[PDB]
Design a binder for this molecule. Structure first.
Ligand SMILES: [O]/O=C(/[O])[C]([O])[C]([C]C([O])=O)C([O])=O
Ligand code: SF4
Length: 753
């Protein structure tokens, strides 16, 4: 047995490739067919590979992830529920990353110092719960959860789960890294099997070589536009083909990260040479040597069947830019001027922002600085404001040492703390008025409803960092840098050459400042106290147990039109301050959803009083009056971000079922976790038969069984009614979370509590 440790922080926790192969060959003697790469890593982590029913898109796989990662906006509710198990130690290597609460205001040092004082109480809670239950803690300044994971924790054939929808970034180093809600991270930290609907697999055949201004980001901007935000739901994405090798490991992580935007369970690349080189450059040459020894198990089987296959010729791919309000509205940088024209999107760029976990790598900063260098060499600074987020303290230390940070500061860039920042709305934007229509281009992933600054009128376009830099220099979406000229301060016209930069540093990466804090899981001792009077942290009161009766005469709180993402159900930005307090954060419930009745966000009719008002207040008014209610939704309800708050908040305010045409995968699992009923119309045209006024009866809950639809009676005000059927994807363990009131309660009742 090789004794090669998972990371430099867990010397004693070894990679189990032996276990993986054992289970793969068990499964493969039962399936007798080629396995894809995500099927080898996923079925190789099955708790029972000899008896697990394995069928794509149909069965619930009982799995054993190798490790759990949390970030600080979703770690507070995950540790509060983990304290409730009363387990004294986590069962797997687990980390907390403090990246989500640092607000971009004046730039890195100022900002991080501001945030450590602003967020003391929360950072203290998370460090102390981390020391107490054996969770490694990365302090504010460490970096964005996914960078730190790529540099320290992802490896070939890992199964990692993270409480973030962009955990898929770790597929850049051949692991299966899946985003989940905090209650799923609590399963694995408490030792209980994690279940995952068995994934379908989309294969993206890559061909050719990326050239010029075209970078890895453009491969996923292209696949998102092709497949749409709904195209990857319930599937893992597998890249393969000759083109794979032309992409660096952090470029493969960029392509896997924004796979989240098509609803994919996760994305992965096969173990290869550029992965090997990235491991070695990060002090993990030993993991790369063991991976070489099991590479048989870390690449797809010849002839493996993909459910969908898409092909991309990398050498014909052009620079793209997606937006302004969906990540799947794709444009070549070439024609984006004209479309903004036709469609009335602002052509002047207010702010260009490079960073986020999607595009904050050393290679990313290197190509951004290569573009900035040329502009600087002609006496130019940025026309648009320009912000730069480094992905980790190591990348800030190294780009500082290798001079990228001074070039980018010299064209007028502000380099922010190594934190999410403007990406989740942790931004004190001061250059517009609220409501001012404007355009910002970013090298981020998502571009929902100005969610960068809380201005619904901000038009955000996602692109590659080097195109963000050429466009912040030019100030307008009319600039295509592959073909347009700029005028130096010397009155001479020049065109920007395509960037070229080092994938990795020549020397060692400079680690920067000390930000890791290992659990003294020696003595431990110190207790985590949360103030009975905190406005930011509150202990979770157990949700109520099911009374065993039907859901009769349900009031419709809202019938939502169109796109209802978790940023519509539970916004971030000024709400991240309450990610540890459920009653305070429940005050954003669905304030962004569009009411079909009047097509307004946060204006629903209260049915007792007949006044139109805040969706949060109406839900508390129905709860205080004993009126149980339902949300009716459209398609891909709950798209986007991972936050289990979008499911904790409707349960907390009296919610009972969310009936939709379809759900996003993580949100639907979060709804089952919190004792709500996610249900879908057996016929989606029945959405059209429910009017905001109807009362609805969900009958047959005494007979709730796997694969059997429920009856819904739509009670119309004129006394007519009509019965429809509702399908559900509950298996018997999720039906027991329902009966008990939540999965947490089901655990406490199994724990003879
Ligand atoms: O990745 O982005 C976002 O949105 C965030 O990060 C989320 C969670 C929270 O909110 O925190 C997810 O998950 O995704
Ligand atoms: S997508 Fe943005 S808010 Fe989510 S982790 Fe990446 S940088 Fe942070």
């Amino acid at each position: 047995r090789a004794k090669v440790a998972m990371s430099h922080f867990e010397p004693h926790e070894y990679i189990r490739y032996d276990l993986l192969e054992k289970n793969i060959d068990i499964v493969r003697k039962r399936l007798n067919r080629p396995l894809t790469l995500s099927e080898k890593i996923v079925y190789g982590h099955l708790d029972d590979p000899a008896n697990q029913e394995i069928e794509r898109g149909k069965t619930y796989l009982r799995l054993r992830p190798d490790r759990v990662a949390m970030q600080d906006a979703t770690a507070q509710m995950a540790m509060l529920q983990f304290i409730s198990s009363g387990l004294p130690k986590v069962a797997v290597p687990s980390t907390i990353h403090c990246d989500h609460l640092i607000e971009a205001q004046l730039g890195g040092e100022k900002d991080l110092r501001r945030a450590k004082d602003i967020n003391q109480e929360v950072y203290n809670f998370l460090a102390t719960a981390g020391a107490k239950y054996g969770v490694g803690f990365w302090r504010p300044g460490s970096g964005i959860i996914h960078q730190i994971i790529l540099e320290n924790y992802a490896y070939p054939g890992v199964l990692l789960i993270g409480t973030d929808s962009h955990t898929p970034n770790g597929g850049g180093l051949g692991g299966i890294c899946i985003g989940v809600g905090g209650a799923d991270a609590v399963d694995v930290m408490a030792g209980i099997p994690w279940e995952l609907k068995c994934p379908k697999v989309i294969g993206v055949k890559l061909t050719g070589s990326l050239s010029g201004w075209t970078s890895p980001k453009d491969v996923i901007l292209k696949v998102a536009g092709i497949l749409t935000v709904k195209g990857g739901t319930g599937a893992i994405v597998e890249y393969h083909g000759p083109g794979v090798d032309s992409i660096s490991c952090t470029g493969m992580a960029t392509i896997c990260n924004m796979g989240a935007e098509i609803g994919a369970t996760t994305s992965v690349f096969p173990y290869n040479h550029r992965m090997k080189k990235y491991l070695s450059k990060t002090g993990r040459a030993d993991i790369a040597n063991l991976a070489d020894e099991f590479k048989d198990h870390l690449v797809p089987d010849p002839g493996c069947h993909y459910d969908q296959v898409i092909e991309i010729n990398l050498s014909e791919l052009k620079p793209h830019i997606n937006g302004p309000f969906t990540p799947d509205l794709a444009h070549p940088v070439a024609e984006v001027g004209s479309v903004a024209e036709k469609e009335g999107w602002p052509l002047d760029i207010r702010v260009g922002l490079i960073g986020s976990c999607t595009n904050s790598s050393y290679e990313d900063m290197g190509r951004s600085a290569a573009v900035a260098k040329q502009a600087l060499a002609h006496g130019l600074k940025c026309k648009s404001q320009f912000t730069i987020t480094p992905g980790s303290e190591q990348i800030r230390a190294t780009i500082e040492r290798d001079g990228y940070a001074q070039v980018l500061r010299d064209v007028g860039g502000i380099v922010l703390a190594n934190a999410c920042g403007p990406c989740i709305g942790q931004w004190d934007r001061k250059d517009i008025k609220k409501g001012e229509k404007n355009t910002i281009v970013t090298s981020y992933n998502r571009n929902f409803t100005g969610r960068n600054d809380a201005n619904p009128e901000t038009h955000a376009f996602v692109t590659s960092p080097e195109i963000v830099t050429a466009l912040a220099i030019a100030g307008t979406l009319k600039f295509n840098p592959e073909t347009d000229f700029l005028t130096g301060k010397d009155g001479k016209k020049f065109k920007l050459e395509a960037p070229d930069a080092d994938e990795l540093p020549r020397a060692e990466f400079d680690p920067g400042q000390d930000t890791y804090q290992h659990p003294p899981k020696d003595s431990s001792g110190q207790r985590v106290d949360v103030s009975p009077t905190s406005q930011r942290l509150q202990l979770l009161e157990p949700f109520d147990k099911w009374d065993g009766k039907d859901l009769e005469d349900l009031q419709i709180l809202i019938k939502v039109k169109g796109k209802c993402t978790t940023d519509h159900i539970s916004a971030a930005g000024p709400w991240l301050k309450f990610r540890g307090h459920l009653d305070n954060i429940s005050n954003n419930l669905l304030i962004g959803a569009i009411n079909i009745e009047n097509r307004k966000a946060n204006s629903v009719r209260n049915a007792v009083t007949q006044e139109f008002g805040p969706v949060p207040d109406t839900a508390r008014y129905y709860k205080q009056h004993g009126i149980r209610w339902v949300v009716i939704g459209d398609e891909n309800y709950g798209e986007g971000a991972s936050r289990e708050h979008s499911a904790l908040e409707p349960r907390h305010l009296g919610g009972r079922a969310i009936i939709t045409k379809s759900f996003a995968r993580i949100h639907e699992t979060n709804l089952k976790k919190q004792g709500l009923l996610p249900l879908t119309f057996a016929d989606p045209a029945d959405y059209n038969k429910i009017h905001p006024v109807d009362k609805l009866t969900i009958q047959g809950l005494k007979d709730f069984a796997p694969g059997k639809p429920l009856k819904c009676i739509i009670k119309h005000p004129n006394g007519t009614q009509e019965t429809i059927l509702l399908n559900h994807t509950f298996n018997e363990t999720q039906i027991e979370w329902f009966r008990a009131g939540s999965a947490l309660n089901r655990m406490k009742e199994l724990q003879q509590k």
